[PDB]
Symmetry: D2
Subunit: 221 residues, 4 copies
């Protein structure tokens, strides 16, 4: 009734799936082999059997190219000195390669505009989402009309505290910042200043940005 361990290859070029499967299976069963529950031979045969099935599935049925990408997982049971895969748990993902002829032109041309983009300031817009229990105001942040983050403003007297994050086009964290407000409406000040505020935000992991966006949005909902 307990969950079974799972053989997972992660992403691998299709030409390499067989040795990925074998190496992962050996790594997972290293202790079973040292303990004498299983022999090397047992594990090699189990991996070889699974590769034999995958070959028919990936190469003959799905027609995967050797330069495509696959990810495979399957659960297995080791008991009574025998390994059995549970094929009802087999999952296969496939990604098909975009021909270089199609990509390279685009990349080449784009690389010419790149040195500009590296430095050029990101322009964002905002729309009000609501207020918190404590009277903070929450805004959604957008990049080219699409939602990418959130901002939270705490009104003071002719100033305010601002904090927020965006996930795109690069993940940024705007740490608590105190700013003088020169506009009757906080709304007006947020509209004209959001891009300037983020021009000094810090670069972080996407995961961190996502957490902060979600925390802020949760305070209004």
């Amino acid at each position: 009734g307990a969950m079974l361990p799972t053989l997972r290859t992660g992403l691998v070029i299709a030409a390499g799936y067989a040795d990925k499967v074998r190496r992962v299976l050996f790594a997972q069963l290293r202790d079973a082999i040292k303990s004498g529950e299983l022999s090397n031979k047992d594990v090699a045969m189990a991996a070889g059997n699974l590769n034999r099935v995958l070959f028919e599935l990936l190469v003959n049925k799905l027609k995967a190219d050797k330069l495509d990408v696959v990810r495979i997982q399957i659960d297995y049971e080791v008991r009574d000195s025998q390994i059995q895969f549970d094929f009802s748990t087999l999952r296969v993902e496939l990604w098909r390669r975009v021909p270089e002829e199609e990509i390279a032109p685009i990349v080449e041309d784009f690389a010419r505009a790149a040195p500009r983009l590296l430095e050029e300031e990101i322009r964002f817009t905002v729309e009000k989402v609501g207020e918190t229990d404590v009277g903070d105001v929450v805004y959604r942040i957008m990049y080219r009309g699409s939602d990418v983050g959130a901002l939270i403003v705490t009104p003071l007297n002719g100033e305010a505290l601002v904090r927020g994050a965006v996930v795109e086009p690069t993940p940024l964290l705007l740490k608590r910042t105190r700013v003088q407000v020169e506009a009757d409406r906080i709304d007006d000040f947020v509209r004209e200043s959001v891009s300037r505020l983020f021009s000094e935000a810090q670069n972080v992991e996407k995961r961190e940005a996502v957490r902060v966006v979600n925390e802020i949005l949760s305070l209004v909902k």
Copy 2:
């Protein structure tokens, strides 16, 4: 020549964190030594990620569940990181929808047990003979070249060794059989599948190497 930032294969939704993590790993010594600040590296990765966003999401229309692999050279000058955009390479692989894959995977879940029951059927074709008179055969699976074997005739007996890469990598270790020299060809054609039903499961790279070693003996 320059260090290269390399992501390896990554799901597109995760490319930015991979870029950041790889760059920090590569420049950990330059930071520990004060040559660069944590901030310098974060900003470099951040700026690169911004550029990659426009490329991947706009120009290449990559979906977040696609796979990408990215590399670009960079230089560390005067405590600044500078990317060489003429070395920017991007690879893209587009996800096959579950609808196309799931039913097919489902079939093999069902057919796997009986598929494993069957001995793998191989066929052979003579390729040539070596300097010392060993006979070399190519091995095929469903008509396509997958391997090779080599047979050394002795007096009334013979040594056999070989490998196949597909449908699973198998190494046939040196095996001694009793057979008359003038029937070795008949022997190979009749018994290739039986010989390999007892071969060793190995890495593909090993089987690939053995097949090439064998074939090279009959190619001048």
Copy 3:
């Protein structure tokens, strides 16, 4: 700046395959483009591996079950890889014998289950006011600094949030508690463990960023 072959952490027994695999991966594009052959790369990795063997076994006296991390710069000249040995760096960690580790782990393993669910006790030390008048506290575990807490006094209420990195990373999200302003110090010293007993389990890196964000407001 030159490319750098880097192994990351690897058991000494396996450093050779790591060096080889990393070198091929880094030169994948130069091979494709005929700048180098597979033979050239394989041979370069092989020669480097031989040199590292001598250093590891003769000079560093590394055991095959020790851990190493190696790096060295290289360039490609006239279709041949050339290593720059002035940039060779090797780090080594020596295995603590299993015989010494196992009794300690085994004994502790017996108590682990009890310890698993038990409440973590924290203490605090007031740091002081921020510019706008929130109050920051350091959080300590067993007399050691592990986190920070920031309290924003309201009208008969206070907002509290914070984080600790040890003994496990926890994030206390924005929480509104009923407390009088003159009672805040006492409330915090009295309730910090209770508050964190229902904090969010997070990554250590998240908690670190939050602790630094908070302490920077008063440093």
Copy 4:
């Protein structure tokens, strides 16, 4: 019952064990989460609790430094939307850092000689093991007095085929090579030529060399 899944960190610097533990557990339980069998919260708490316990073991009991390396594994059972660790399966390995001050000077000195050490053929020695049933001669190969490989010699007529493999000081495969030599001179020939032969051997992965050595040694008797 069936063998349980195992949480394994691989090698990790001690200061990073908690996040490795958390990331691996999430990766392994991603499907249980997506299926509704477990929540993100369940997994986060399981990992956090384990990390809490590991903190006491690593930092206080084994007294690991943050810059040491550790590797941790423990089995766990998931069933009925509940994660339970089996602490009787907890295994921890520790490696203590060798101070830079101590290694750096050794490495720097060695690096002076490294280039001139590549102008040098690897010197192997051999010892005869025995003959195979068909009369091939098998030798063990040694480097620094230790067994690192094997060679097999098949006498022809005034000639011989030689092949073999070593795993140290770097993995090398000597492909079938035909050489001129009288049969009663093979021992002498092998002593005098093994190092010269391996100077042109193929560089391979360690496992490839191991397999050849074993297959050659298995033929003896």
